[PDB]
Design a protein around this ligand. Sequence first.
Ligand code: SF4
Ligand code: SF4
Ligand code: SF4
Lengths: 208, 156, 114, 318, 144, 176, 70, 56
Amino acid sequence: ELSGEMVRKCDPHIGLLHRGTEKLIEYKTYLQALPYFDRLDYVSMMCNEQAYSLAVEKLLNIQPPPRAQWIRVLFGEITRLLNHIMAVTTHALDIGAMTPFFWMFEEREKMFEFYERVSGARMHAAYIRPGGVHQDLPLGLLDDIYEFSKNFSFRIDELEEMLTNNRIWRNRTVDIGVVTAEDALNYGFSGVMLRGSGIQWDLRKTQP
Amino acid sequence: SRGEYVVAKLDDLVNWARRSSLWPMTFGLACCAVEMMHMAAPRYDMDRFGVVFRASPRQSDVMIVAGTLTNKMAPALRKVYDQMPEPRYVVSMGSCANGGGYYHYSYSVVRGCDRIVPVDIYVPGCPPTAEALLYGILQLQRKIKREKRLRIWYRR
Amino acid sequence: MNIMLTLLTNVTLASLLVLIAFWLPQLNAYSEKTSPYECGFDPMGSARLPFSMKFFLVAITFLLFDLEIALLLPLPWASQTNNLKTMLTMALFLLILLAASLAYEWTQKGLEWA
Amino acid sequence: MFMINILSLIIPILLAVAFLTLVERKVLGYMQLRKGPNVVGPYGLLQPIADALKLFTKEPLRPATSSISMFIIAPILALSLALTMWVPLPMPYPLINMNLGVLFMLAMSSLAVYSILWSGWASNSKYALIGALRAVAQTISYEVTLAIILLSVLLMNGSYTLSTLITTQEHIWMIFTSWPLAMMWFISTLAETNRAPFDLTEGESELVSGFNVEYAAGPFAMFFMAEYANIIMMNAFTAILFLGASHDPHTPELYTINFVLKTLALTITFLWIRASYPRFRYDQLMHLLWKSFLPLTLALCMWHISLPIMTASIPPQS
Amino acid sequence: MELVQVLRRGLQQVSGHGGLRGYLRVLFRANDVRVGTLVGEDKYGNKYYEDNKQFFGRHRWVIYTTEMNGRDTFWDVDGSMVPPEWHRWLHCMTDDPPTTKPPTARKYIWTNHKFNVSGTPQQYVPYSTTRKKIQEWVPPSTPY
Amino acid sequence: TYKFVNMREPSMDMKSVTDRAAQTLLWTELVRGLGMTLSYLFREPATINYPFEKGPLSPRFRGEHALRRYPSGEERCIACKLCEAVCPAQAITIEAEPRADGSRRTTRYDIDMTKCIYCGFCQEACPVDAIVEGPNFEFSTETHEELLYNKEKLLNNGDKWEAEIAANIQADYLYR
Amino acid sequence: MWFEILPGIAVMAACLFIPGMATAHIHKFTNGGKEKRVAHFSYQWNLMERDRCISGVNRYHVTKGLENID
Amino acid sequence: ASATRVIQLLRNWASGRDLQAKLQLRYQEISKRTQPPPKLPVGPSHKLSNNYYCTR
Ligand code: SF4
Ligand code: SF4
Ligand code: SF4
């Protein structure tokens, strides 16, 4: 409900992409349900797979092998890089930047290639499963990941150059969407939504 | 016949214009949209082929149904397809769009976008790789190249 | 007459283009295709209902400043007078009055919206 | 033979607009680590023609709620006005030499705005109405500062005749004299042409397509052609006003080449800005122009009024 | 200057493709005028080239044949035209070309690769592969 | 453990004030962004010339399903139906009967390429390596029915792609 | 690479160049090999009309010099 | 890359960084597609004695 272009009331209508995932999981075995979690958040598939695997392992009272755990943490951080690339670049594109999107999506393609080499699926791999990881890293993947990581910082710096200090970008975002820390906590916000307000909470540190 | 030759050449020109300039509408439902963006990304840039994403349905020529089509979203998809001017072509991307895929037996999923809107090219995969989507788009371009509207007009 | 001929030629080209666009293509117009566009779902109300203008004051002030734009355009020929002192004084008087008006509206929270 | 001249101005300009679309697509792609259109024709040369053919062979839809008369009139007005504004420009010799060509261009630019407002209102769609209101706000923001900057710069010319700008800048570019006014003028031209970072009327990210959301096929092609032609024409106006060129009366081709190159550079700058910067909020655009550009323009207008007097440099009226 | 060297390289590209006619042919067919080492050519006619200097993803490319399986492919080319043996080399699954490392020879393996046949009379049509489950009674042919 | 983004205070010395004033009036940062875009203009584009150039893929790629054979020519499938059981989307329909030789073979093997999620299961699950997701990804069709594969279609795909499938399995069989 | 952009720019540049050259040469052809006279004030138009009268062919560009005298 | 020295200088100056050192496009630095066969290690439970499943 807009008076002019001012939003008097914003009412989100959802369910346009409700596929009954939770109902379907009940009809599937634990392994069969694993691919569902990849689809829940298309941008961050492996992290959802890891969350499901952790839940199933805790119920199973079984411990993943250490190399499996380190592979999970590594690919989770790669998934975080993908997710944040998508979020920041699509946010800029919606506010009109439209170049960092392509710039960073090239790197997203490279990280997809890492996904494909490990699993054979560029996205939605079933790599992380309860009890560990399906297959060991193909030989040569780690050095390629090193090659990518050594250069990724320059790309992030160029994106900052495009957006961080721009007058227009700062105007579009500097004081929009302010959320109080207490309001953020009560409303159930998590992650950067809480940390942006100044609350110091990251489950990776508080609850590794 | 000279008339047949003129009709064939004009049909060639029209089909070339339509296939060379294919403007998909900015319609992405689900994970398959991400592979579509990667197709728009530099590696497989679709702008080289003349495929430019245009938001307005009336300024678009192709609808790519990327992602699962829920029963809630189906009327909006049909509305967007109808509001799209013709000639209009529909490409169904991903198993979810093609036949329902992982959520085929869900209450809230349409078991294929063919039920709601006519589909020209089906791109298999879940998610289909960006190269697969580009292959499907080029296949649609060849399908347009094979069209014989003016020849049929002359023969009718 | 040259300007009239040029205007006619341009308008005729545009009208011919519109005619060719509305007659060369094939059409299958049906109700759902010609319905209004509301991002897929149907519109709630009309698009002819009132649309509040949060910058009305700025628009009226724009009219009043376009008047000053009109008053200042003769300045290039004014600089050709022999009484350049009076001309300069009056031109700076008008520009300072425009500046004063802008400053007043600004300080009185008139250039802000809503 | 004047009709031949009118066609010579019109037809080549439209082809220039068509190839400008290709140039923009390729320049943005290369600035984005991509290759612009290359498949259709050698190095993508035939892409424009394919786009024009596709649009004009596509069904045009008349919205059920639309006011047909204005809906059709608006694209005609936009294209005709876009073509008309090219007439007074000296390249080097103008097609129509007017004593007050600059005011003519200002009035014609004012008239073109109604095409956007009429299109948006006739569409009878909420997004189109929002785009039309944004266009109204944009004109409110930019018109006064544009006029004041043009007056300040033309005070040195001594007239509103476009042709006399060449003589005034015979020895030096006027950008050296008035580089701040030049900066504000370039931004104001960006605003007038509704180009990024001020692409508010269309505003695809925020408004699905803005005023043209309900336009398809030929009318949309006409709106696009008007937009690009206005971009080129405004950049040419900037080149004439500030980046003057040498004119040898016996050989006009040299001036024409220099002018065309400068205008191409300015249009490329337009595409460059569209690629680089994000989009402004229309409240922010109006605030920028009224609170920042307008006071500096008033001060510089006072300065440019005084300077010819205090430096005994009043330009000749004739 | 390096600019003169670049122009000379462009002329070398013109010569390497067989002259102006070959240069234009390649430019129109594939939109790329690079000249690269010819690793091999399949039976269908597709020629495969390698330029390791070019960055990954462009080091290997294939020039599709003008005629395959009775279809004119001078303008209409498709990815499926690539035979399986060269598919892994082209897609970088392997670093060894089929010529250097031939695939294992099996009788059942097809000898002629078919491209995507959708939209053609050879298109696959689904059908049930199982026989009728329930058999009905056949009425006697005598009146009684 | 925690880092402060923002939380920096600008200097108030005349030089810093003049620098920030120049940035505001002279648009320095926008010019820096423009320079970045120009540098990208002069960098080599990343577009690959598809179809002539194809993107990298690994031997573990999951594409079109295929039914393999033994070197003899006998079909590897032994109608275990465990690969049907593990299918997350129930995209595989299998029926079997003792064949004339007496062997356990599949009378019906159907994979609906429209219900499949290309998970890669039943390649791990199938005990005899019979069913394999091959390298092919460009199997788009103009009709929905073309994507409902049959045992004949799957066996034809296996025969078509066996040369590549065997090499990829050889490459990745030790990792499995 | 970036040079591939240049051909479209060249086509656009030629299209833009056509108008000014066409205008100049058309003016030359219509006005007898000389630039079209600029009449921004009534005096110059009066001069043009007087030249039209003097020429005898009702064309102002036709210039009669000392030869016509005496 | 294959850029001429002039273009390299122009791009580096425009960026403010040495682009040549870190290039987004991938060259011979990437790992070879064909790799030596692996020998994956076995896990803790691969023992012939004292490995009764009740313990683990
Ligand atoms: S087909 Fe697969 S990738 Fe595409 S939307 Fe459905 S689950 Fe996501
Ligand atoms: S491996 Fe494949 S063919 Fe063999 S029994 Fe299992 S599903 Fe059937
Ligand atoms: S790879 Fe295909 S056949 Fe195998 S389980 Fe997944 S969807 Fe079913």
